[PDB]
């Protein structure tokens, strides 16, 4: 089973450096060329770099040449991306891909892609979010307002994942150089407030976990 696991993604100040890693398994890593492809907020796919099976031949597009360095360690089954002179237009999801063709021979495109690591290039500081419960003043809609955090992302879970197929996660929007998002749950009238409903917000960027119990009014 082919597995490509990227890591290293982070918030970096413009002009800074960052090293991405990709752990490969389930295939003879040393017989394939690897590549990095990034996906920007507009959802566009952009080829970043490629390295031959051995690490002898390296290819870059004009957007990255001179700033980025692709490398690999065939003994550790790992692919690397050393990024330097980072700029805001480098903010994207970085995917580790595997070139479909065996060693040198051409005609097969990249087939396996990893899950990605997101990289944020911004002069904005890490801010933990403020979590506010949304309770009303057969079914009942509850919510959580997660305001003023940076960078993305935050992860909201209801009853620590026990709730539900009835969750909605609203994409964050940048408001005054900080992100704001919301989440909602719909539970039967019989379960709330008789049984406890809590939202758990985690922002790994600020090492923040905040659990807010939703309580009724009046």
């Amino acid at each position: 089973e082919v597995q490509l696991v990227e890591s290293g993604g982070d918030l970096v100040k413009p002009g800074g450096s960052l090293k991405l890693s990709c752990a490969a398994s389930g295939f003879t890593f040393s017989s394939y060329g690897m590549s990095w492809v990034r996906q920007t907020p507009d959802k566009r796919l952009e080829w970043v770099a490629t390295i031959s099976s051995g690490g002898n031949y390296i290819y870059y597009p004009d957007t990255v040449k001179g700033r980025f360095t692709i490398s690999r360690d065939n003994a550790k089954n790992t692919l690397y991306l050393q990024m330097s002179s980072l700029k805001s237009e480098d903010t994207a999801m970085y995917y580790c891909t595997r070139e479909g063709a065996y060693s040198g021979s051409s005609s097969y495109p990249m087939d396996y892609w990893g899950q990605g690591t997101s990289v944020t290039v911004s002069s904005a500081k890490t801010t933990p979010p403020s979590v506010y419960p949304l309770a009303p003043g057969s079914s009942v809609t509850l919510g959580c307002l997660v305001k003023g955090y940076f960078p993305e992302s935050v992860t909201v879970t209801w009853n620590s994942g026990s709730l539900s197929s009835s969750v909605h996660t609203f994409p964050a929007l940048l408001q005054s150089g900080l992100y704001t998002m919301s989440s909602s749950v719909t539970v039967p009238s019989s379960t709330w407030p008789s049984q406890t409903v809590t939202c758990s917000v985690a922002h790994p960027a600020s090492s923040t976990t905040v659990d807010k119990k939703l309580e009724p009014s009046g």
């Binding site: 597009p61 479909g100 495109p109 990893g114 403020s130 309770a135 609203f170 994409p171 919301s182 909602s184």
Partner: protein, 219 residues
């Protein structure tokens, strides 16, 4: 640089219908020595990385369903889905991998699922105790499980429509029901909030000539 152009940017199709999406390269991707087209198609389902569908413009990858069919040569290519499934909700990208050239991708075609029209379930929420404690006051409206995506939200404070400090966010199409959801947030200061009493949010949707109105009074 070989420019990949995809059309349309997005298309809505009902389950069990035929779908055709086009890809155009700025120059021929046919090899002539190989006599092969160096064009691939990838599918990217929500929250996932892309998955290879078609290579050599016509050949399907291993576990790819027969409903997916690639065609064309030179500069004009198409991806066809014969019996569209709810599972086929994804962004489809074309890619050129011509040997002597830098790798390129098309902008992608967003395939959305057509469902029956559904009206939103509207819920209004007053500012939390802890928010007021910090000096701010956000009034939230959730417009859940509606179809199509087009919806209007107007906020009313003591009868007057407010157009300062509102942010609206749409969810992507549901995996389970093909509907959209939207959250509208009116942000005021604690002072501006305490100066008024009635807070209303009205939703207008294709489904009814009548707005769905949800309100509260600070008492």
């Amino acid at each position: 640089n070989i420019m990949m152009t995809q059309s349309p940017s997005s298309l809505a199709v009902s389950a069990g219908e035929k779908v055709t999406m086009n890809c155009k390269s700025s120059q021929s991707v046919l090899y002539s020595s190989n006599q092969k087209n160096y064009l691939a198609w990838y599918q990217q389902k929500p929250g996932q990385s892309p998955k290879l569908l078609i290579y050599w413009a016509s050949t399907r990858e291993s576990g790819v369903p027969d409903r997916f069919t690639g065609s064309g040569s030179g500069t004009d290519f198409t991806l066809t889905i014969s019996s569209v499934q709810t599972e086929d909700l994804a962004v489809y990208y074309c890619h050129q991998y011509l040997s002597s050239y830098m790798y390129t991708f098309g902008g992608g075609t967003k395939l959305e699922i057509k469902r029956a029209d559904a009206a939103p379930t509207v819920s209004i929420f007053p500012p939390s105790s802890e928010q007021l404690t910090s000096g701010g006051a956000s009034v939230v409206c959730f417009l859940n499980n509606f179809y199509p995506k087009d919806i209007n939200v107007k906020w009313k404070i003591d009868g007057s429509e407010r157009q300062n400090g509102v942010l609206n966010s749409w969810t992507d199409q549901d995996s389970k029901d093909s509907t959209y959801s939207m959250s509208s947030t009116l942000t005021l200061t604690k002072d501006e909030y305490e100066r008024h009493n009635s807070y209303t949010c009205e939703a207008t949707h294709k489904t009814s000539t009548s707005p769905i109105v949800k309100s509260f009074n600070r008492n």
